[PDB]
Amino acid sequence: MLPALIGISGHEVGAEEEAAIRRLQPAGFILFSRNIDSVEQVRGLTESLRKLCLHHPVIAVDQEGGRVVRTASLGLNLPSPASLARLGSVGGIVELGAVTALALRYLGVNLNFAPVLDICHDPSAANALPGRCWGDNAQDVISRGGVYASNLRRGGVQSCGKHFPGMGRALADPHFSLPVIGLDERELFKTDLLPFLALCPALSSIMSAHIMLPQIDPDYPATLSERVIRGLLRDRLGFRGVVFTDDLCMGAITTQYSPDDAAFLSLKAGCDLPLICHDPLPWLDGLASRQESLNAYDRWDSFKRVEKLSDSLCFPFPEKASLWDSCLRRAEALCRLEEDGR
Numbered sequence: 001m002l003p004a005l006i007g008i009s010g011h012e013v014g015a016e017e018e019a020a021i022r023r024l025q026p027a028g029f030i031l032f033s034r035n036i037d038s039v040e041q042v043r044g045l046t047e048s049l050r051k052l053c054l055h056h057p058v059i060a061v062d063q064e065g066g067r068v069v070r071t072a073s074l075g076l077n078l079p080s081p082a083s084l085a086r087l088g089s090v091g092g093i094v095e096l097g098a099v100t101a102l103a104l105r106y107l108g109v110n111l112n113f114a115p116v117l118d119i120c121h122d123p124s125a126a127n128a129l130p131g132r133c134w135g136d137n138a139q140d141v142i143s144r145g146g147v148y149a150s151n152l153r154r155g156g157v158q159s160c161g162k163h164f165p166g167m168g169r170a171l172a173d174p175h176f177s178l179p180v181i182g183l184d185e186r187e188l189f190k191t192d193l194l195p196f197l198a199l200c201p202a203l204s205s206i207m208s209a210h211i212m213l214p215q216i217d218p219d220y221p222a223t224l225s226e227r228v229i230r231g232l233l234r235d236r237l238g239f240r241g242v243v244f245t246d247d248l249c250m251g252a253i254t255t256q257y258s259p260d261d262a263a264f265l266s267l268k269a270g271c272d273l274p275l276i277c278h279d280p281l282p283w284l285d286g287l288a289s290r291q292e293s294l295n296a297y298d299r300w301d302s303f304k305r306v307e308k309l310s311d312s313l314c315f316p317f318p319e320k321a322s323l324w325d326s327c328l329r330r331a332e333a334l335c336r337l338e339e340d341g342r
């Protein structure tokens with residue numbers, strides 16, 4: 001099993017993709033809007049991915065709500081976490097988790113890259129993608145994100161807390177290529193790290209961001225720092241689940257490493273499944289070759305975490321049109337609920 005998630009180009013697995021999947025057996029896949037056109041087409045895509053894999057593959061998506069939604073082509077739209085936080089409706093947060101779980105499960109998706117546990121500390125911090133945050137302090141994020149994650153998981157879809165160690169504090173720095181969190185660890189655990197610690201039982205997994213924590217490691221970002229992952233995340237925070245990386249194919253991280261080396265480095269640091277989201281095929285062979293250069297016991301620990309995740313993955317619902325109509329009906333009603341509450 002290749003320890004990574006890889007993207008898929010289109011509505012069906014291509015020839016080159018299918019070849020690499022048979023040969024390398026990736027732990028799973030991440031889907032985007034380019035993979036989602038109709039219910040039948042999606043269920044066929046996820047069926048293909050499951051059949052091409054000997055193990056039960058992770059099939060993941062960023063179905064957050066608002067401006068991060070991958071199902072527009074299905075007519076399935078969802079409100080943003082920030083809008084449900086403003087609405088103040090507790091039932092609305094439950095329903096976002098429940099409806100997301102129901103729909104993703106009908107499509108054969110088994111993991112959602114949510115909740116976002118970043119804190120939106122100030123309405124001044126500019127965010128290119130607005131609305132992703134559940135609140136402006138750790139306690140509100142824990143309360144709203146926890147209700148979300150609970151009901152996502154209650155519906156059989158695994159959750160992922162992101163982005164460790166807390167993107168709300170990350171600032172651009174002239175002396176660094178990647179964003180920087182200069183906070184002391186003790187203040188981090190009182191604030192941006194607190195949602196990850198408080199919600200561990202509700203988080204199937206956690207995704208690490210490409211952020212510099214220079215007081216802990218001045219040379220490698222969190223995703224590639226053994227001190228941040230094995231020290232801060234595994235030891236002090238105590239998280240025992242699967243650790244994903246931020247995408248290795250886009251962003252400032254690509255100006256520092258190529259995706260195959262970064263994937264290896266993240267496994268060395270203690271992550272379990274780096275994300276190779278866009279054009280993955282050129283990088284998979286170099287990763288699979290460098291794999292046996294890892295400590296065999298570390299590889300065994302990481303495989304047991306991935307195996308535990310895989311064993312919790314749920315299978316798609318049997319075909320039933322009225323079930324999918326309810327997904328559309330409840331999603332539409334959830335959007336109108338937020339719209340009417342403004």
Ligand SMILES: CC(=O)N[C@@H]1[C@@H](O)[C@H](O)[C@@H](CO)O[C@@H]1O
Binds near residue numbers: 030
């Ligand atoms: C900071 C940020 O937006 N990171 C995103 C993450 O949210 C997403 O889940 C992943 C897969 O699409 O790609 C990027 O790493």
Ligand SMILES: [Cl-]
Binds near residue numbers: 014
């Ligand atoms: Cl292909």
Ligand SMILES: [Cl-]
Binds near residue numbers: 066080082083131
């Ligand atoms: Cl919003």
Ligand SMILES: [Cl-]
Binds near residue numbers: 136138191
């Ligand atoms: Cl806080």
Ligand SMILES: [Cl-]
Binds near residue numbers: 201238239241
């Ligand atoms: Cl844990």
Ligand SMILES: [Mg+2]
Binds near residue numbers: 037038073074
């Ligand atoms: Mg369509």
Ligand SMILES: [Mg+2]
Binds near residue numbers: 049050052053054056
């Ligand atoms: Mg299978």
